[PDB]
Paper text:
The structure of the empty capsid could be built except for residues 1 to 21 and 258 to 318 of VP2. However, whole VP4 subunits and residues 1 to 21 of the N terminus of VP2 were not resolved for the empty capsids. As a consequence, the volume of the capsid cavity increased to 7.0 × 106 Å3. However, the loss of the structure of the VP2 N terminus and of VP4 resulted in changes of the distribution of charges inside the capsids. We therefore speculate that the extra density belongs to positively charged ions, such as Ca2+ or Mg2+.
Viruses of the family Dicistroviridae have nonenveloped icosahedral capsids protecting linear, single-stranded, positive-sense RNA genomes of 8,500 to 10,200 nucleotides. The major capsid proteins VP1 to VP3 of IAPV form the capsid shell with pseudo-T=3 icosahedral symmetry, whereas VP4 is a small protein attached to the inner surface of the capsid.
Author numbering:
A (entry chain C), D (entry chain C): 1 to 300
B (entry chain A): 1 to 208
C (entry chain B): 22 to 257
E (entry chain C): 1 to 50
F (entry chain A): 105 to 156
Write the structure that this text describes.
């Protein structure tokens, strides 16, 4: 009635929390509850939407304004809008960030701290988490005009290397190379919108550049020194330059506005780690300009 | 041609070789294997929120002495998606990795308990659902807080009400410095999408 | 003879017998106020639009009403500049005499509608954005709309507010609170807190004595309401 | 006949007593017995009832007297019975405790100990174990009258904040706000009982206050300092105030008694821990008033 | 509802990486990935031979 | 007199020490109880194949 043991010797390895960084597999976390079958309900009557609000098809499908342009009669034709934006007329196609503003405080009489502050579209904000991306971009360019402004406006794609200006702390585009008659727009994919009665256009740009995935570095640490990752992150740029000059009477104003929206469809990503040389630090606005921000460091 | 404005929305497209959804399967099958779809799945992976948390010996410490600090930074995935949403429901799994220069003249052990949110140390009792580990034989403390709330959902950083859902209390005996990692439980999910706040870049701090 | 328990609206009695009640001989109909209008229920009465605010913009502009949206917000002193701030539902309940018609109730489950009637001349352009943010003055500082960038402001839910294309917007601000059924007595409701931002500055001819006006107005009313528990109080 | 091992390496974590605080799951406690299949019988012929005597539907369904009121001809109308009870006429609807008595002993010439002693209905006594509650309350108000006492008595609900008086050590209700003509009873849910031949009434009050569960703190540590938990625990109060004054001849006595019973149906609770700032200490009556009670402390 | 343990005492040997030099058998190497079912594709369209 | 432990992380190829972050998919062992660190790097590439 008490026989001997017939089972073999079960081999062993002592690994507490084996593979904890995976979203699948039964985990040994002890619930501090009354019931082991602790089951919360479904998503009914809790969040007042019925849309599944966390899929990347919906999070990155959220439109955000990137640029607000001022297109004048002073500005020439066949040349993008150079406004001190500084990107403005040259919008880089691609999901991660491309712009930055620099906050300069003081520490001592001869030392300062230059903290890079980036804007974040919701397509951009997801891509900072992941390392390599692949996404079909979208842009909805809208002219804010009166009933009387007319003209013809051209938006053309260009694949590959974006013309730049490396500076000590930022990268600006180079409108010396996109003018003329030195860079024609006769072979690129283009769209010629009409300001007579047409207003909006959505320009879907699918993903084509010689690699399976680009990088999500973008503008982080992009300067005169380290600017390889900025080139290998976009597959080129849209460019908004006017074919025909703005025709406006003296009654209406000579300035119109071009609002560039942005999102990304069909988004797929690769690794759940940031490719940047720093953790995902969310910028908290200081109360007074004399105060600085705590910096996350890389020791363990 | 008349003086007026219309809307006439145009979804005009560039390069149109093949359907987009078909090439994305073929691109990830040779570059990834893994196919990341839903951000709900990233609230199940334990990303380390701190690298060092030097806890003073013999003190019932609430994790809100660390959670108020570490929900600002957005280092993990819980506090980085604390900016794209407003509400949350579900319990927070915690794992504690011991990194202490242990001493043989003591018997080191670790407790854990429950407090409701944002109470202080002495204003709660100790008999509740507990858990205990011994870091000589088991360096990992495998604890999951359930979702015991008055309300069906919770907004972030609420008003002068307090003690409206439950969280963790962490009791030890010796001055154990640790690693703390976390993610939500099986039914942890956000909701009510808003737009995202800003980001912070590199802070090299050049002299002029 | 023993069982006299009758029921009013929300009220019950307990007598020994039915106390020998006399009434009208025949209930003949009289003057025709029923034939002039149907009776408006209290759920029907909290669906009337009210004229709340009347915002006039001149470009201009010396004032804050045409400071455009900042591309970056570097510090809390230079917060995001707006036009007006409606702290729902504490604005829509006080105005239009609604709070003197939902007195002696306790809990409310509303959805606030917002409509903007807009009326400007053809020689003026511009664009605005009507964003709402729940718990915008309750959450921590970095999460509010007034501290994020221009891409972060516009990423909040809302609607475009162009002049020449949109003379009316319809936005449905949902029941967006964690508490079931808003409290009224000793009320500190202020859950969803609305905003109005100009994206581009309003544009007109730079020569003055021309009067380039805008003249926005705001209508709000409740929807899908349920008003449940009776009390004796109320806040004034 | 002795082949090699084909099983994989079984991973391992050394957790003795994994999840001991759960009522389900096979536990490793060794029986100190002769038989591993140690099976006690069922509940037949052991306890002399057949009712399942531990379900919360039956434990909290046990009626207990809370208040004994003295309603006089001296007392006015449209005003609750203020008797130094001190609650008396204002019974807070809700499952946990609301009353306390304070025991004052001596330690030194200038130091004393004030120990809070609470009464315990069986609906109250279960709720001290759990943290958050939700229950459909019940009350059976009975008039102890003669054959000759008549009158009309009103019991009306009120949802929300109960009027109070914070003192140094206890909270009393505020009969200055429930009198008049300054607090009408024309819009509340009410019942108008008749003392002519009707005697009893049971007034079931379901659970309605803007939250899924209230708290089980009640009166523990309720004073001038810490009285947030007392407000967020009840969903208001019943109020017994007379419509018409007591009509009694000189033969029968001018004092009648109103006995307020209490239980709770459909009870559900949330966490098996006390929300109070102290363990569940059961008050043991001392033999002599000069002796004090041992106090449970919070170290481990 | 919380009965006693009925399983026998499982015997034990502490051998981390038992038989690592064999091309067959399930190995305990932890993937540093998002998905436990991390599956690369087949050999189609990668190497330009068949 | 110490508590020895081992971490592991990911970098893309041929980066140096300080020019990468640390929050990524990790693994941890304790060599007092487990002398073997059992780690597998996945194949997260931009290109379908890599020359040497």
């Amino acid at each position: 009635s008490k026989p001997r043991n017939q089972q073999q010797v079960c081999p062993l390895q002592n690994v507490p929390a084996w593979g904890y960084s995976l979203y699948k597999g039964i985990d040994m976390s002890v619930p501090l509850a009354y019931d082991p079958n602790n089951e919360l309900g479904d998503l009914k009557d809790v969040f007042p939407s019925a849309v599944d609000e966390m899929a990347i098809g919906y999070v990155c499908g959220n439109p955000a304004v990137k640029h607000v342009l001022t297109w004048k009669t002073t500005d020439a034709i066949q040349k993008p809008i150079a406004n001190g934006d500084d990107w403005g007329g040259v919008i880089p196609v691609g999901m991660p960030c491309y712009s930055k503003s620099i906050r300069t405080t003081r520490i001592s009489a001869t030392e300062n701290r230059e903290t890079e502050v980036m804007d974040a579209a919701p397509c951009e904000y997801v891509a900072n988490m992941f390392s390599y991306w692949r996404a079909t971009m979208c842009y909805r360019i809208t002219v804010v005009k009166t009933a009387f402004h007319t003209g013809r406006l051209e938006i053309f794609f260009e694949p590959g290397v974006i013309p730049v200006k490396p500076t000590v702390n930022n990268i600006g585009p180079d409108q010396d190379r996109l003018t003329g008659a030195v860079a024609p727009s006769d072979n690129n994919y283009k769209y010629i919108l009409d300001l007579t009665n047409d207003t909006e256009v959505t320009i879907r740009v699918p993903f084509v550049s010689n690699k399976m995935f680009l990088k999500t570095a973008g503008i982080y640490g992009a300067n005169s020194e380290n600017n390889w990752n900025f080139h290998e992150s976009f597959s080129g740029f849209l460019c908004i330059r006017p074919v025909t000059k703005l025709m406006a009477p003296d009654t209406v104003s000579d300035n119109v506005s071009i609002v560039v929206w942005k999102w990304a469809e069909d988004v797929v990503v690769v690794e759940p780690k940031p490719l940047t040389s720093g953790p995902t630090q969310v910028y908290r606005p200081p109360p007074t300009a004399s105060t600085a921000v705590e910096v996350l460091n890389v020791e363990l | 041609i008349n003086i007026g404005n219309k809307t006439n929305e145009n979804v005009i497209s560039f390069f149109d070789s093949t359907d987009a959804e078909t090439q994305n399967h073929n691109a990830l099958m040779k570059g990834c294997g893994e196919f990341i779809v839903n951000l709900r799945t990233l609230l199940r992976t334990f990303r380390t929120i701190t690298d060092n948390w030097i806890l003073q010996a013999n003190t019932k410490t609430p994790i809100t002495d660390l959670t108020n600090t570490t929900d600002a930074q957005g280092r993990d995935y819980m506090s980085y998606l604390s900016y794209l949403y407003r509400f949350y429901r579900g319990g927070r799994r915690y794992k504690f990795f011991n990194t202490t220069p242990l001493k043989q003249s003591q018997t080191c052990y670790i407790r854990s308990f429950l407090i409701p949110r944002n109470y202080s140390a002495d204003e709660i009792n100790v008999d509740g659902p507990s858990h205990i580990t011994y870091p000589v034989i088991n360096p990992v403390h495998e604890v999951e807080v359930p979702f015991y709330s008055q309300y069906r959902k919770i907004p972030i950083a609420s008003t002068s009400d307090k003690g409206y859902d439950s969280s963790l209390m962490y009791f030890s005996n010796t001055a154990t410095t640790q690693i703390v990692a976390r993610a939500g439980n099986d039914d942890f999910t956000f909701g009510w999408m808003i737009g995202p706040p800003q980001l912070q870049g590199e802070s090299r701090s050049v002299a002029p | 003879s023993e069982n006299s328990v009758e029921t009013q609206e929300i009220t019950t009695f307990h007598d020994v017998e039915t106390p020998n009640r006399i009434d009208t001989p025949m209930a003949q109909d009289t003057s025709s106020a029923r034939n002039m209008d149907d009776t408006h229920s209290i759920i029907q009465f909290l669906q009337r639009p009210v004229l709340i605010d009347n915002i006039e913009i001149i470009a201009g502009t010396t004032a804050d009403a045409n400071k455009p949206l900042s591309r970056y917000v570097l510090d809390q002193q230079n917060s995001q500049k707006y036009v007006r701030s409606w702290t729902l539902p504490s604005t829509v309940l006080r105005a239009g005499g609604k709070a003197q018609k939902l007195a002696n109730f306790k809990y409310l489950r509303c959805d606030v509608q917002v409509k903007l009637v807009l009326n400007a001349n053809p020689f003026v352009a511009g664009r605005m954005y009507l964003a709402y943010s729940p718990y915008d003055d309750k959450v921590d500082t970095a999460r509010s709309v007034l501290q994020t960038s221009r891409a972060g402001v516009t990423g909040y839910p809302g609607v475009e507010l162009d002049f020449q294309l949109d003379n009316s917007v319809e936005m449905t601000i949902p029941y967006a609170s964690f508490q079931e059924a808003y409290d009224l007595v000793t009320g500190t409701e202020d859950f969803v807190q609305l905003y109005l931002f100009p994206i581009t500055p309003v544009l007109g001819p730079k020569s003055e004595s021309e009067s380039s006006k805008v003249d926005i107005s705001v209508y709000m009313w409740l929807s899908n309401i349920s008003l449940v528990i009776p009390t004796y109080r109320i806040n004034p």
